[PDB]
Structure formats: structure tokens, C-alpha cells
């Protein structure tokens, strides 16, 4: 807020707007009807008690076909004032049929709905006071617009179209530092980047990039920032950067270009820098599939977080704004939790009961997790780690891989997803697999897991995960054993099998070429540069991607620090753990910066496997 | 006598006016150019006016 990104301050605006709208609906007893996908987000913002006390609504429901049978049971009952639906139409451009069938059948006499949208900063605070009646109606907005958007398909029943545009802007839930935008799923639980229908990839990609650009524009115009340097990586990031630049340069108002002349300008500057490094998940498919070792990573891949940051099996919330025990243990390694918990418990003995309840709950949950790690296919949780560590450095032999893949297939029972992920990593690590092993691996797969597995192994065999030795979308076509020489991923590191992520070193090289100095270096343009630059580092990335055009460096202004590292394609939460380590080590070395990680939705190995199915 | 008194008063006023400017700059300031006073120079006049030493020379030209 006001050039200082007070992230928690973003939370209040959405709640205030929703409360004002709901209280301005009607001063009676209201019943709320909320879409299943958006409800968890709303509950993570407004508590039930606050919702009841602030506005006279007293009931919340869900959009389901069960309501059709309950139309004469639930909808017929209550209905003290009216029914206020809440829908999300930001993606999939289609209203759910539930409201369509309920409107005509139950014959509601008052239809009011709520639709979500990003904040229209271009409205610039209603533009003063309409310029004293538009200086004699010199400007007007009647019919100066298309008749309807998306909701033009709603042209049935009555004219009760009291729409209400509730505003929404990103706010942090999992942690103070990192915000999160939900644009990676539809209402049908289909991945927005890896859809299970290989006929409409291009449109889905365009829609995703458009929505991401819209969210970034909303945040940028809300915070009143001036981007100075852009480091785009990949193909889609190029289009995203160009579209964002065009949209910023088109829709910006006046009274700020004048400031753009005063600040920065010609022959002078004021020492303000913001960076917009952008990456794509397809660039490095090496590390969304490794096993998590941090506490929240282990707790995540065994029990999937929903849209809200909570879990079904437990009841206590993991929100950071009311508890401090979770703050200091979320990103620590699993091994260093026990003794720390023992010390925390023993120090309080000499020494309010809410802390006791919190520590008891944490101890019980940790004990349950430790118990469930073992005795549940004992040794698998470690065996996969040793196998992954062996594969990453490279120890594959002639036809011996077929012996170990089925070694744990039925000796220890294991899910399909683990095997599929491991074989994908095997096929991806060597950057190529010969033509004499697919004929056996695919045969065994189709033998053991049905007939539909052939379709999965065919569809997944074109995104780059499952390739054969015999508009490129920026795949990776270089052996990984080479990358272990330029970079020092395998020696400082946690949340993995002792391996540094590839994105980690990719962002490291932009500011300090130390590891690149040890290997493949005789001269460098610099050793410590404050501004992001890319020079004399083309050939290494020319062979790494097959084209010396993936790297893009853009300077916008002609002539401590906020860096916006967005993530198009999900964030593997282990990267968040190493981001803090990067910030700490860079601050120690001398360069002081602050990182904000924009995420389109948490991504994880198993969560990917159901996507392409 | 009146001329002598007037000359004495004028000399006293001139002597008093020396090193008694005590003009003040407001929190943030600018004029004529519009951009910012504190970027080029501080050509300041009485009755609250500000110039860049460049806008003024542009005006006279």
C-alpha cells in the first residue's frame, strides 16, 4: 500500500466491499447461496460469526443438483427476503445450469446474483464528480457499450437482473510474503495448463495468460508502481510481457505521465527499481516431481490442500495471522521438528491455555504423521528417496532399469502415481530414451494397468515429459549430467533429496555468477551487478533450449527493492523454501532485495497426474 | 534637512535589508516548470515564487 506493499492490508478491502454489498441488498432476513468452488475462498476471509453479526444473513448453502430435490424442501422453506446467488464466471465463460433450471421450475419472483471481477483501476475514483454533469451532457454512457458480456446468454424468465459487481484483488493466505491467485482451475476441476483434451490447448493458454495479465495489471495499478526492468524467460512469457506492456501503455490515465516525466525522466533518476522476472513451468520439468521433505511439503502430498489453506480430516485452521507456533515450523525440515517441539514444551513447564492447546494439537499431529510415515509400506518413503538420488546423478546401466522398476511394483504395494512419476523422471533425466525400451515399458504398463493407459502414455508423450530418441513451446533438449557441471545443484539445500532446483540457479545467475565462475568461465562482464543483465550467457542457454531467443531483456524507463517473480504454471512449494534462503544469502552478500512470489495455484506431482488422465 | 533625513533613513533600511532575507522553502515546492523545484536550482523570489534558472531564461527569450 502506497509504494510499500502491505500485503495484509489487501484483505480488508474485499471483506469491506462484500459486507457493504450484502448489507445494501435488503434489511431483512437473507439466505446466501454460494458456488461450491468459491465458497472455501470466502470462508477463509470472513468467519461465520462475523458474517452473522455484520449483515442480517443467517443461512449459507451450496450449488448442487441436490437443491433441485430440495427446491420444495429448502428453497420452498426459509426465503424470508430473497435468494442471493454467488457465482464465478472469470473462467469457462458459462453459468452453471443449476440456477437456470431452478429459476424456471421453482419460479422465483426476485433474482439477484453476485459476479466477481478484478478492480477497475481505470475508473480512477469515479473520475472526480462526472465533471459537473459532464459539462452539459458532453459525455454519456447510455448504449455506449455492448449489450452484455458473458451474461447475454441469460435472456429467459423474468427481467430480475439486479447484478452486483463485487470487487476482488489478490490477498495472501498461506504466508505473509506470498500472495496467491486462483486461475489454474475451472469449475469442473480441470487443470488450466494441462487439460485432459488434446484439441484446444492454444485457446486455454491464451485465456490463462490473459487472466494472469489482468491480475498483474490490477495489482500494479493498485500499488502505483513503475516497472523498470523485465527479464522474460520462455516463449509464453514473451507474449505475456508484450501484452502487459501494450495494455499498460494504452489504458493508463493522465496526471501520471506527468509524474513519469518528473520522476525518472531524461538525464536524471531517483534510484527506484522494480524487477519482473517471469518463468514458465515447462522450462524445468525436472523438479515438480521430486519428493517433498519439508513439513508442509510432507503434509501437502499426503493430504491435498483445497482452495482454502486447510484440510478436511483435521479441524484446526493453519492460518498464520492468529498462531505463531505454525509460523516457526511450517518450512523447517521434518527431522528438526521433534527436538524443537520437545524444547518448546519443556520451556513452558516452568512458566495462556490457548498456547497449551496449540502445542498439544501440534504434538498429536506430528506424532500421527510420524506414525503414518512408517508401517505404511515400510521403507518405500526412503527407498524412493535413495532411488531418486541415484538417478539424478546418473547410474543407469544396460537393461538393469527393467529389474528395479518392477522390484517395488508388487514386492511392496504402491500406487500408480508413484510409478508413473518415477518413470517420467527416468525418461526426462537422460533427455532421451532409446527405441528398444518403450516396446517393453509400454507393454508392461498396458499389461498391468488396463487398456486406457495407452491413451495416457500417448497424450503425455507430446508435452515433452515422455519423449523418444528417434511454436516449439520451449522444451528442454540437453542432458542433465551436463547441467550438473555448469551448475552446482548436487554438492545448503532441503525440501528435496539434497538437490538445488534448476529455477534456483537460473535466478541465481541473473545477479551473481559465482557458481558459473567456478565451471565454464574465463571472463565475465561483472561479478556483482545491482540491475538485472544478461550478456555473454547465450550459447549455454542456446543449446539448453535449441534457440537463442528464449531469453528476453526489456528496459522500459528511458535513461529497498521489490521483485515480482510471478509463476505461470504453479509453484512447487519447495521452491518457496529456497526463495527465503536466497533472500537471506543475497542480503548477507551485500545486495538487499525483497521477493514477492505471485502464484496461479499450488502445483504438485500427484495433483498433476490426475490432470492428464 | 528633509533630504538628509531621507538619505539617512534609506541608508538604514538598506543596511538592515542586508543578510536578513530569512526566506523559507515549503515541504515540497515547484512553479512555472511544474516538474520539481529541487532538481536544477533555487532561483527564488519574494511573494512565494520558484524557478529553475532555465524556465525563467526561456521566458525572457
From Swiss-Prot, chain A:
The keyword Transport applies. InterPro entries: Sec-1-like_dom3a (IPR043127), Sec1-like (IPR001619), Sec1-like_dom2 (IPR027482), Sec1-like_sf (IPR036045), VPS33_dom3b (IPR043155). Pfam families: Sec1 (PF00995). One of its GO terms (molecular function) is ATP binding. GO terms for biological process: endocytosis; Golgi to vacuole transport; intracellular protein transport; piecemeal microautophagy of the nucleus; protein targeting to vacuole; regulation of SNARE complex assembly; regulation of vacuole fusion, non-autophagic; vacuole fusion, non-autophagic. Its main location: other. It is found in: Vacuole. Keywords: Phosphoprotein, Protein transport, Transport, Vacuole. GO terms for cellular component: CORVET complex; cytosol; early endosome membrane; fungal-type vacuole; fungal-type vacuole membrane; HOPS complex. It comes from the Eukaryota. Component of the HOPS complex which is composed of PEP5, VPS16, PEP3, VPS33, VPS39 and VPS41. HOPS associates with phosphoinositides and the PX domain of VAM7. Interacts with IVY1 and VAM7. Present with 830 molecules/cell in log phase SD medium. This is Vacuolar protein sorting-associated protein 33. The gene is VPS33.
UniProtKB/Swiss-Prot annotation, chain B:
A zinc finger (RING-type) spans 30-55. It is found in: Vacuole membrane. Required for vacuolar biogenesis and for trafficking of hydrolase precursors to the vacuole. Mediates transport at the vacuolar membrane where it may be responsible for tethering transport vesicles on the target membranes. Acts as a component of the HOPS complex that acts during the docking stage of vacuole fusion. HOPS is an effector for the vacuolar Rab GTPase YPT7 and is required for vacuolar SNARE complex assembly. It remains bound to SNARE complexes after vacuole fusion. Present with 2020 molecules/cell in log phase SD medium. Component of the HOPS complex which is composed of PEP5, VPS16, PEP3, VPS33, VPS39 and VPS41. HOPS associates with phosphoinositides and the PX domain of VAM7. Interacts with PEP5, PEP7 and VAM7. Belongs to the VPS18 family. This is Vacuolar membrane protein PEP3. It comes from Saccharomyces cerevisiae (strain ATCC 204508 / S288c) (Baker's yeast). The lineage of its organism: Eukaryota, Fungi, Dikarya, Ascomycota, Saccharomycotina. The gene is PEP3.
Amino acid at each position: 500500500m502506497n509504494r510499500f506493499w502491505n500485503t495484509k492490508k489487501f484483505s480488508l478491502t474485499n471483506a469491506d466491499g462484500l459486507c457493504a454489498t450484502l448489507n445494501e441488498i435488503s434489511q431483512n432476513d437473507e439466505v446466501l447461496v454460494v458456488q461450491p468452488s468459491v465458497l472455501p475462498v470466502l470462508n477463509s476471509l470472513l468467519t461465520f460469526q462475523d458474517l452473522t453479526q455484520s449483515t442480517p444473513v443467517r443461512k449459507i448453502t451450496l450449488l448442487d443438483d441436490q437443491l433441485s430435490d430440495d427446491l420444495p424442501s429448502a428453497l420452498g422453506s426459509v426465503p424470508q427476503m430473497d435468494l442471493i446467488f454467488l457465482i464465478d464466471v472469470r473462467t469457462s465463460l458459462r453459468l452453471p445450469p443449476q440456477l437456470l433450471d431452478a429459476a424456471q421450475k421453482h419460479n422465483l419472483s426476485s433474482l439477484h446474483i453476485i459476479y466477481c471481477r478484478w478492480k477497475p483501476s481505470f475508473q480512477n475514483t469515479l473520475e472526480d464528480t462526472e465533471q459537473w454533469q459532464k459539462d452539459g451532457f458532453d459525455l454519456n454512457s447510455k448504449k455506449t457499450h455492448f449489450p452484455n458480456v458473458i451474461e447475454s446468454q441469460l435472456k429467459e424468465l423474468s427481467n430480475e437482473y439486479t447484478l452486483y459487481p463485487w470487487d476482488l484483488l489478490p490477498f495472501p493466505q498461506i504466508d505473509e510474503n506470498v500472495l496467491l491467485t486462483h486461475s489454474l482451475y475451472n469449475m469442473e476441476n480441470v487443470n488450466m495448463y494441462y487439460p485432459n483434451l488434446r484439441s484446444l490447448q492454444s485457446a486455454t493458454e491464451s485465456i490463462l495468460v490473459d487472466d494472469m495479465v489482468n491480475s498483474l495489471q490490477s495489482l500494479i495499478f493498485e500499488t502505483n508502481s513503475i516497472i523498470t526492468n523485465v527479464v522474460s524467460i520462455g516463449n509464453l512469457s514473451k507474449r505475456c510481457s508484450h501484452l502487459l506492456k501494450k495494455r499498460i501503455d494504452e489504458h493508463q490515465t493522465e496526471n501520471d505521465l506527468f509524474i513519469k516525466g518528473t520522476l525518472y525522466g531524461e538525464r536524471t533518476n531517483c534510484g527506484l527499481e522494480m524487477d519482473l522476472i517471469i518463468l514458465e513451468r515447462n522450462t524445468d520439468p525436472i523438479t515438480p516431481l521430486l519428493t517433498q521433505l519439508t513439513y508442509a511439503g510432507i503434509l501437502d502430498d499426503l493430504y491435498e490442500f483445497n482452495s482454502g489453506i486447510k484440510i478436511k480430516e483435521k479441524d484446526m485452521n493453519f492460518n498464520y495471522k492468529e498462531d505463531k507456533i505454525w509460523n516457526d515450523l511450517k518450512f523447517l525440515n521434518f527431522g528438526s521438528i521433534g527436538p524443537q517441539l520437545n524444547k518448546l514444551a519443556k520451556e513452558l513447564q516452568t512458566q495462556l491455555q490457548q498456547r497449551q492447546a496449540f502445542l498439544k494439537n501440534h504434538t498429536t499431529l506430528s506424532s500421527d504423521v510420524l506414525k503414518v510415515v512408517e508401517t505404511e509400506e515400510y521403507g518405500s518413503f526412503n527407498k524412493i528417496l535413495e532411488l531418486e538420488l541415484e538417478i539424478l546423478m546418473g547410474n543407469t546401466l544396460n537393461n538393469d532399469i527393467e529389474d528395479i522398476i518392477l522390484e517395488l511394483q508388487y514386492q511392496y504395494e504402491v500406487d500408480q502415481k508413484k510409478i508413473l512419476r518415477l518413470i517420467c523422471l527416468l525418461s526426462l533425466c537422460k533427455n532421451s530414451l532409446r527405441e528398444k525400451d518403450y516396446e517393453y515399458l509400454r507393454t508392461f504398463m498396458i499389461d498391468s494397468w488396463g487398456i486406457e493407459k495407452c491413451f495416457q502414455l500417448e497424450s503425455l508423450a507430446e508435452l515433452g515429459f515422455f519423449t523418444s530418441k528417434t511454436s516449439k513451446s520451449t522444451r528442454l533438449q540437453k542432458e542433465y549430467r551436463y547441467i550438473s557441471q555448469w551448475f552446482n545443484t548436487v554438492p545448503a539445500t532441503f525440501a528435496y533429496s539434497g538437490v538445488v532446483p534448476l529455477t534456483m540457479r537460473l535466478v541465481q545467475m541473473l545477479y551473481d555468477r559465482s557458481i558459473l565462475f567456478h565451471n565454464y568461465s574465463s571472463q565475465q562482464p561483472f561479478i556483482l551487478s545491482r540491475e538485472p543483465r544478461v550478456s555473454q550467457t547465450e550459447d549455454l542457454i542456446e543449446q539448453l533450449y535449441g534457440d537463442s531467443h528464449a531469453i528476453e531483456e526489456s528496459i522500459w524507463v528511458p535513461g529497498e527493492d521489490i521483485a515480482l517473480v510471478v509463476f505461470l504454471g504453479g509453484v512447487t512449494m519447495g521452491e518457496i523454501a529456497i526463495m527465503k534462503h536466497l533472500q537471506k544469502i543475497l542480503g548477507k552478500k551485500g545486495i538487499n532485495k525483497r521477493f514477492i512470489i505471485i502464484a496461479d495455484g499450488l502445483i504438485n506431482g500427484t495433483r498433476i497426474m490426475n490432470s492428464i488422465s | 534637512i528633509n533630504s538628509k533625513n531621507l538619505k539617512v533613513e534609506i541608508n538604514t533600511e538598506i543596511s538592515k535589508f542586508n543578510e536578513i532575507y530569512r526566506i523559507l522553502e515549503p515541504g515540497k515546492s515547484c512553479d512555472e516548470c511544474g516538474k520539481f523545484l529541487q532538481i536544477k536550482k533555487f532561483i527564488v523570489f519574494p511573494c512565494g515564487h520558484c524557478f529553475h534558472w532555465n524556465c525563467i531564461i526561456r521566458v525572457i527569450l
